[PDB]
Amino acid sequence: VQCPHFCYELDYELCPDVCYV
């Protein structure tokens, strides 16, 4: 995924939705 690691440590969607969905 084109999304950095910290997004998945702080699992809540502070990063854009593309990371998770």
Side-chain angles (χ1 to χ4, degrees):
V1 187
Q2 39 55 268
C3 176
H5 181 245
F6 65 86
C7 300
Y8 305 109
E9 306 306 280
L10 303 178
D11 294 87
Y12 59 93
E13 304 194 287
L14 37 52
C15 296
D17 298 83
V18 68
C19 289
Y20 313 95
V21 56

